[PDB]
Design a protein around this ligand. Structure first.
Ligand SMILES: [Hg+2]
Ligand SMILES: [Hg+2]
Ligand SMILES: [Hg+2]
Ligand SMILES: [Hg+2]
Ligand SMILES: [Hg+2]
Length: 264
């Protein structure tokens, strides 16, 4: 059950003015593609806060990657889901090396040394990112939906034939040259707990089949994510605002905000 929104004063949507004339803002299966200028964050914040939404943020930090945690978490505190309940899950081989970062109210961190059902009772949504990154701008409830992938910054303007999908038919990740919507990046996906567990279960089984068959997909996890998201369309797609690489790719006019980035 969803309670009424309160009175709010904001600009009227303009039916005869497009959000963007430079980019696609809806997929052919009518999922929004999230770019700056498409959403009113006040509206979305109200909707998600009224549902007392909790977001889980999962990172795997093994060996030398533990060194990235301090910047990752400090910047998450500044930019990720601020105002909402957040639960960080840091999966590491070095629990004592996790930095002691100060968290805002309503935000908590669990260190798990390297199950599943723990997530279903603790959070509403799971967001799965790489830890060698930092937040630079708002990443909020506008991303939340049953299942989302993010447009890989090197491929968003590419034709499908140029996508680095797995191309050998012997791999469970195979996608032929006449298939594919987008090239999603392995480093930033998420959704409801139930849908993220579906995805990771599917990719885990496909990867075991490939291993039994003597084949390893070209981009590993990412190749299988792309196969999954081809066959199970995401309910939102995030623009490359959401995982950019300024060193490799600069700051093109199409990007109004650079929200989350690879550390150089
Ligand atoms: Hg708009
Ligand atoms: Hg995850
Ligand atoms: Hg998969
Ligand atoms: Hg996997
Ligand atoms: Hg996957």
């Amino acid at each position: 059950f969803m309670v009424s929104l309160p009175r709010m004063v904001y600009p009227q949507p303009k039916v005869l003015t497009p959000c963007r004339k430079d980019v696609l803002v809806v997929t052919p299966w009518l999922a929004p593609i999230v770019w700056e200028g498409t959403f009113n964050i006040d509206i979305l914040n109200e909707q998600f806060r009224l549902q007392n939404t909790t977001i889980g943020l999962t990172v795997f930090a093994i060996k030398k990657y533990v060194a990235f945690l301090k910047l990752f978490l400090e910047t998450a505190e500044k930019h990720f889901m601020v105002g909402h309940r957040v639960h960080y899950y840091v999966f590491t081989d070095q629990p004592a090396a996790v930095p002691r970062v100060t968290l805002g109210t309503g935000r908590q961190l669990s260190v798990l040394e390297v199950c599943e059902r723990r997530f279903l009772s603790e959070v509403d949504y799971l967001v799965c990112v790489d830890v060698d990154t930092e937040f630079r701008d708002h990443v909020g409830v506008e991303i939340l939906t049953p299942l989302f992938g993010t447009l890989h910054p090197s491929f968003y303007g590419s034709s499908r034939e140029a996508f680095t999908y797995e191309r050998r038919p012997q791999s469970q990740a195979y996608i032929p040259k006449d298939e594919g919507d987008f090239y999603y990046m392995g480093a930033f996906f998420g959704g409801s707990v139930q849908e993220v567990q579906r995805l990771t279960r599917a990719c885990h089984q496909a990867m075991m089949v490939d291993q039994a068959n003597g084949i390893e997909a070209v981009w590993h996890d990412e190749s299988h994510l792309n196969k999954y998201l081809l066959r199970h369309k995401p309910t939102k797609v995030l623009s490359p605002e959401y995982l950019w690489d300024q060193q490799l790719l600069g700051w093109p006019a199409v990007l109004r905000k650079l929200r989350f980035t690879a550390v150089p």
